[PDB]
Amino acid sequence: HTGVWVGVSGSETSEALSRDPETLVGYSMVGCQRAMMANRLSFFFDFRGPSIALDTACSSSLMALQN
Amino acid sequence: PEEVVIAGMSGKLPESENLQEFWDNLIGGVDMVTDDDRRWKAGLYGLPRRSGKLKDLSRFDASFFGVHPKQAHTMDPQLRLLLEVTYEAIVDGGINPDSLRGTHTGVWVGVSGSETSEALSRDPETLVGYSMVGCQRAMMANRLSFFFDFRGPSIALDTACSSSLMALQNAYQAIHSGQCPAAIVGGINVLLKPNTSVQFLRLGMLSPEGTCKAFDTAGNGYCRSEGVVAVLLTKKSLARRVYATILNAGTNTDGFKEQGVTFPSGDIQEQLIRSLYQSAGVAPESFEYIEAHGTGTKVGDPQELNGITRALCATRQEPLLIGSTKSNMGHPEPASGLAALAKVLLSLEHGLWAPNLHFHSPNPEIPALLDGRLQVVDQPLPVRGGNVGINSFGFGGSNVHIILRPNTQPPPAPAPHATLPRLLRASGRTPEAVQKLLEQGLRHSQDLAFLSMLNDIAAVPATAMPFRGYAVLGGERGGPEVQQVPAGERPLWFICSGMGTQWRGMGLSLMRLDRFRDSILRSDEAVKPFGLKVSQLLLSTDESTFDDIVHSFVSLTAIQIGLIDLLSCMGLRPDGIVGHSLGEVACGYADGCLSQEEAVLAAYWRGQCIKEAHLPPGAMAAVGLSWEECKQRCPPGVVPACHNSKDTVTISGPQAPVFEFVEQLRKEGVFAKEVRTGGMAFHSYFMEAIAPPLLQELKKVIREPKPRSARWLSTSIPEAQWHSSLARTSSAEYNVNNLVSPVLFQEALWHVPEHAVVLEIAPHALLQAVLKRGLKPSCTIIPLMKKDHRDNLEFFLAGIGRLHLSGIDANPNALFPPVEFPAPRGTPLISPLIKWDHSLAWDVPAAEDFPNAAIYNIDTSSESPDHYLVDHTLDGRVLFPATGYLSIVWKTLARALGLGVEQLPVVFEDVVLHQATILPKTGTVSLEVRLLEASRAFEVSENGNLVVSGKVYQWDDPDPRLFDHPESPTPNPTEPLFLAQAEVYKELRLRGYDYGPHFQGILEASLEGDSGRLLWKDNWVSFMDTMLQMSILGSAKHGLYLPTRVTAIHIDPATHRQKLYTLQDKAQVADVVVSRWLRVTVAGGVHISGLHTESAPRRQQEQQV
């Protein structure tokens, strides 16, 4: 039932990879959206617990640890 | 732990400014997903034509929420709407936000996009620093916590498509474990950047038809929809209204799956549901309606529905209702959970289930639908009873699920206190808000829970909300009254009136109020020994009953103590107290220096000693003569009894001298009236004879004196001697002297601050006129009771309302019995009632801002502004005019220099056309223009192929001499005949030019082709093409000739305006001249030199056979 809590506060890569509308590949949103920062880990490691990505404004890591 | 409940709710879902509109759309079946161009021009990038969208993002009550205007512009629309929605939600459950301040309430907000962060951070040089404070995704929760002063956790989850329900689950765990006593869960999603929709389309999730045809055979995708919902979850102890109770909530992740990261798993969902309903202790048969995710995906729907079938439909008999809210409003990606919760709670509130749109052929892969074990809500079905479920499955693999037990508290049985009138008070930003609240309250004059909730949330300081208003419900009369409340804290004063104010059955109406009845009953107990029952006296209807002094005094005291108690219940502590003669004792109680029994006994014994004396008859009258003038005018035996006012005075004495003086004064014309003393001398030497027995009795009555406070100003001891022993304590001696001593009432008034609020605590406001006259004009007065009124309870409530309008906060709910909680189901929602101040427009990001060298798309659709180009047909196919190239390059240059077209005289040089662009009948063609300011050269390209090249630059010094019409090649044609429009375009048709009405702009032409008059329909393309038509008209070369090179062109709009003229009709015309010797064509304000045309092939396919 292991869970994942990831403290993240930026997705600049998502902004970069969505620059062009004609030539943007769909699977970018699988691999750059903020939510996937935890869902990808849950997917590879086969964890059935919670999966969360929280900003919390510069205390994301220690917040995730508290959760 | 403790039960957790969904206290409040609020939001702005698609096509709904408040949840009331949301329910009205849902039950009415109206599809909430539109096809307008609000967010971006429809049909772009192949994106779905239809999507759900809010109504207006450009409104925000900036001043109230303490955001300075500059930072208001640069704040994400999500947060601007979310502050309002959260405030509305908190007050929905009838909880004043100030109460939560200082508590550990949290704010869990589910946001998946920060599109506005990019929008305000795309220009490094001129980007303002405020953006981070109001746009960074973390500030979504921090801003709420900062305004409402919440000390609990402040997070912002990011799981996609499930952030809202995950936030709700986290809040449930927080409150359930006792960490937090309240929580504000919310979700926000606004569609601004089309690139995100393009991404989703590339992934394959979006349905081209733009309809989330949930559970149907033809399920394709989901239509993006935007909403902002918030919910307030608090423990069962603090709740006012309980929409539902959260029995349990949990979540789990899909983990590895063979199909892929984006393939939902049914086994995990079944496990989650079973684990929740087993752990919580809820029987599987209990569930009634489950709000399946219903994304409409061909894959997700069968998986989720089969999971629900295994988890709940295994061993139950009655069918289980299954519905999906996304079939109405679309799919709010990160706010999906809260939208479904709002739908479920509204359905529970109103007693019906909202039907599901777009369900005609049930899907075959879900057997339960065909076997009837699951039933879709195709029509509005009445809610039957039982638990409810909700589940959102974000595509990242995060699953959540919540069990809800509806609130079913029945309306209370009618009670006598329901018949009695109630008071209502509402506050808001603008008068429309107060009127809305009062009107809605008046529409429910019987829902006591609704009225109490409204009264609770009305306590807000004037600065926050500058308009208040009160309305008495159920009274014989009296409408709403809303007036602005001037700023500043204002003082409150009590003034207790004296003798004469008693009347028949006074106060009989107030006895229906419980607190007043308790006060009067305590008084009746207090005065038992002497055979007088205050309640019995009040009820007694004999007119002579109040002839005796004893009854009058006791009754006045009892009524005043009752009124002081009634005010005391509301929490009002007076700052100043100034009484008048008898009833100063009432003031004594008001301060606290006297006990109710002590005061009533003092009053009774004063009265009784009055009788025992048997003093000679004596009448006191009001004399218009002032206090200084009257005294020296007073005859022997008469003196100034009470210095009521400068204009009004009272003097007493033997009845005969009083009558003689009154008649003499009436001869002099001054005011005079005898007060109802009943024949007992008041505040004169007559009372001197009573002091010894009265002093004895009073010493008996009050045994443990108390010290008078600085609030109450002794209107019996002159201001000079306020440091005496008597003035310190209102002992028996103080009251004795007060009885004997004159009434220096007016003098004591001055110390009333400015703007202060005066209350006349007494049965009959006899002194209200006196206070008005002798008080600062800035003050405010209130009677609280009027003689011989229909229902004094109504008047008292009206007075409390007027007090509310005057600044102080006196909540009236406490007057009647407290209403049992939680609020019964059916109480109309309070969230829609709140109205904000939306008189300013705040900025929102535009499509242009988001990233995706002038590009001009030419569309010939009838709605397109370039439809006029459909009339430029040469040899049977539409071609883009050369003048069109000139015009687009001109506009691009104008944009480069910053000026407008009509103020930019331009010069073209060495213009060359390479290939002719054919506008297709359908679709569009894109044209690209690039300028090289340094080299004064431009270039037009299409699909990467050069179409036109040349030099364009601004004209520094225009010369009107240039447009003077050149000498005609034939000085004297001397031919009255001339070609008209029909003949001109007949000739051009014969050559091969097929021009439509728009491009037909040659009203006349000379036979030789040298001069003519051109129309001006306010379109440069048509005008210059008409000039080229004139040039081609005189050519002796049969065949289709098209321009290929123009050496130089000069355009000066000012000369163009000065050259035009109007005919007998309203049409404008500009003369045109062609000179083949100089090779110039001058018309209006256009000069064309060095044209060159090359014979077109003139070959067209599919010629008529």
UniProtKB/Swiss-Prot annotation, chain A:
The active site is at C58 (for beta-ketoacyl synthase activity). It comes from the Eukaryota. It is found in: Cytoplasm; Melanosome. Ubiquitous. Prominent expression in brain, lung, liver and mammary gland. In adipocytes, S-nitrosylation of Fatty acid synthase occurs under physiological conditions and gradually increases during adipogenesis. Fatty acid synthetase is a multifunctional enzyme that catalyzes the de novo biosynthesis of long-chain saturated fatty acids starting from acetyl-CoA and malonyl-CoA in the presence of NADPH. This multifunctional protein contains 7 catalytic activities and a site for the binding of the prosthetic group 4'-phosphopantetheine of the acyl carrier protein ([ACP]) domain. Homodimer which is arranged in a head to tail fashion. Interacts with CEACAM1; this interaction is insulin and phosphorylation-dependent; reduces fatty-acid synthase activity. The relatively low beta-ketoacyl synthase activity may be attributable to the low 4'-phosphopantetheine content of the protein. This is Fatty acid synthase.
